[PDB]
Design a protein around this ligand. Structure first.
Ligand SMILES: Cc1ccc(NC(=O)NCCSCc2ccc(CN(C)C)o2)cc1Cl
Length: 145
């Protein structure tokens, strides 16, 4: 995750093993019930796309629910690319590139690019955009059972 220190510096930290343990144990009790969504939000404050992929990797054992989630992520990433069709390069040398759907999903972006977007002024909130797509997928799963 990104956290803000006392001087206002944005600081990256790797995801807590205790956050992953809590997320696994949460899913073991509430996998198909509405509470999985606010508990996912509670455990992903300031999460990068790489943190979010790490959280999903710890719970992939229920392959049919994970398949539904990954299909929803691919649908929302395709919709992002339709609204934001990528240019051949950035506006000028030294500017960050605009993220793709796969960059927001953390599959074609580096952690350093994710930190760059999330610590922009104002933030380019790729972690929160990916959380929205994950929460849409979690919604489909609890609707369906
Ligand atoms: C919405 C949703 C619904 C369900 C799920 N995952 C699952 O049910 N995983 C099943 C377990 S994973 C591997 C694992 C972690 C802990 C254990 C041990 N224990 C089986 C006692 O074995 C994921 C999402 Cl994202």
């Amino acid at each position: 995750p990104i956290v803000q220190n006392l001087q206002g510096q944005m600081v990256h930290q790797a995801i807590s093993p205790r956050t992953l343990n809590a997320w696994v144990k949460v899913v073991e009790e509430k996998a198909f019930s509405p509470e999985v969504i606010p508990m996912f939000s509670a455990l992903s404050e300031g999460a990068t796309p790489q943190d979010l992929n790490t959280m999903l990797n710890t719970v992939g054992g229920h392959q049919a629910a994970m398949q539904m989630l990954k299909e929803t992520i691919n649908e929302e990433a395709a919709e992002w690319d339709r609204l934001h069709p990528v240019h051949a390069g950035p506006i000028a040398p030294g500017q960050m590139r605009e993220p793709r759907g796969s960059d927001i999903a953390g599959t074609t972006s580096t952690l350093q690019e994710q930190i760059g977007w999330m610590t922009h002024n104002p933030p380019i909130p790729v972690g929160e955009i990916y959380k929205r797509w994950i929460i849409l997928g979690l919604n489909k799963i609890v609707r369906m059972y």
